[PDB]
Amino acid sequence: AKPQPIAAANWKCNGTTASIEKLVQVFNEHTISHDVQCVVAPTFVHIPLVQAKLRNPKYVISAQNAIAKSGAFTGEVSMPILKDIGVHWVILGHSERRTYYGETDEIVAQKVSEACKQGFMVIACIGETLQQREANQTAKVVLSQTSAIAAKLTKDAWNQVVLAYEPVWAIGTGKVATPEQAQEVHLLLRKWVSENIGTDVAAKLRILYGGSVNAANAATLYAKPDINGFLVGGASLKPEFRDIIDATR
Amino acid sequence: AKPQPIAAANWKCNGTTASIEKLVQVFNEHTISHDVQCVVAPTFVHIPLVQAKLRNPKYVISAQNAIAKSGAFTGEVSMPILKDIGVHWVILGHSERRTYYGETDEIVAQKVSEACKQGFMVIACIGETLQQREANQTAKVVLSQTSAIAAKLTKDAWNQVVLAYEPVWAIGTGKVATPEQAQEVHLLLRKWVSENIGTDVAAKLRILYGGSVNAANAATLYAKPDINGFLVGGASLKPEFRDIIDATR
Secondary structure, three states: OOOOOEEEEEOOEOOOHHHHHHHHHHHHHOOOOOOOEEEEEOOHHHHHHHHHHOOOOOEEEEEOOOEOOOEOOOOOOEHHHHHHOOOOEEEEOOHHHHHHOOOOHHHHHHHHHHHHHOOOEEEEEEOOOHHHHHOOOHHHHHHHHHHHHHOOOOOHHHHHEEEEEOOHHHOOOOOOOOHHHHHHHHHHHHHHHHHHOOHHHHHHOEEEEEOOOOOOOHHHHHOOOOOOEEEEOHHHHOOOHHHHHHOOO | OOOOOEEEEEOOEOOOHHHHHHHHHHHHHOOOOOOOEEEEEOOHHHHHHHHHHOOOOOEEEEEOOOEOOOEOOOOOOEHHHHHHOOOOEEEEOOHHHHHHOOOOHHHHHHHHHHHHHOOOEEEEEEOOOHHHHHOOOHHHHHHHHHHHHHOOOOOHHHHHEEEEEOOHHHOOOOOOOOHHHHHHHHHHHHHHHHHHOOHHHHHHOEEEEEOOOOOOOHHHHHOOOOOOEEEEOHHHHOOOHHHHHHOOO
């Protein structure tokens, strides 16, 4: 049996107080009747508003990034600061951060390890570029990204790990991976985890797909046996996030 | 006559809800009886708490960084998002961001220009390294940093600019610039502004000093004619920020 699914909203760098209040009300009013962990990841400055307004019992709040330690890091938000304010989920290694903001495999791996030590649930993002896919390097890349993370984790830390496979070419581009494309990658990831980390770990691990998930494509993705839900960007700013949650039934 | 001074607290990546509530109460209870703009720059996730608790009428709240535009920038906070939530001050180009987080002169200049266009008051940070100082390059460096910013500003934008001269070797090191060291740089900066931007602009411009400012050294710094207040890191997490404010009398 599949583990508990996750439907996660990565709002990225978007929102106003008014738009968030309206969308949160929509999410609150959508009654969910199956076992699913819903996640909303607002910008840092919007975390308190979401904490104040979001009440749907299936939801938890995540940060979109963090640094490991407090101190003289003007502009950054640390893991201890998030834990103190009640945020104990974090997205780490998103492609935008890997690409724009210097986050190498080593940096991502270190952040994931620090977050697990500090008691976070971590949505750790992996995924190949268009060039890597066309060179037949998808497996090599996602396994190298995953193994880099794994090298800094104890076995027991994996209870806190969620993988999000987001092919870079599918992020924001209007070009979702097909169910077959996504399932092939999720299958190979789960096999690696089973063999390298443990059979128990692999059975319980959520491996989410992201990159152009929408209300219309989500259910046929979720029907694949190794897809455990979604990390949703653009559609998660809209009422159709409700449909995406319901696609994990 | 000097323009209105500023006393600015850069909390950097520090705080808990409990510590912030206590410190804000201390700041609230310290009654200020002269014309000074006090500024507190909390981490992004702490902005709403500070907005809720800080009531001293001499204070405004600043961000420690921003990006110019909303969109698909996971982990970042944009200038429109800050304006919407009521934050209309921002620190840009802090040395930690120049050094750790890729912010070149071009990047800082672009951010300052975008922030001014969006109606922010901007505390734009400049300053030389220890090696640059020892090579007799202090003036060259701070004027190059300032001119890079200036090249992207209209004259009228300078009504929104505050410069913060923070020699890198003084930040967090227990080694404040002497009043004479700081004044020499502030004098040369103001002369450049007077000649390159305008005499009116230079007379009104606040040029703040930062780098190891504390309660005991602040008044003799402020006595210098071209120092208009302070950008304070470590001491601003403590009750002696009150003394620093009072040193601008």
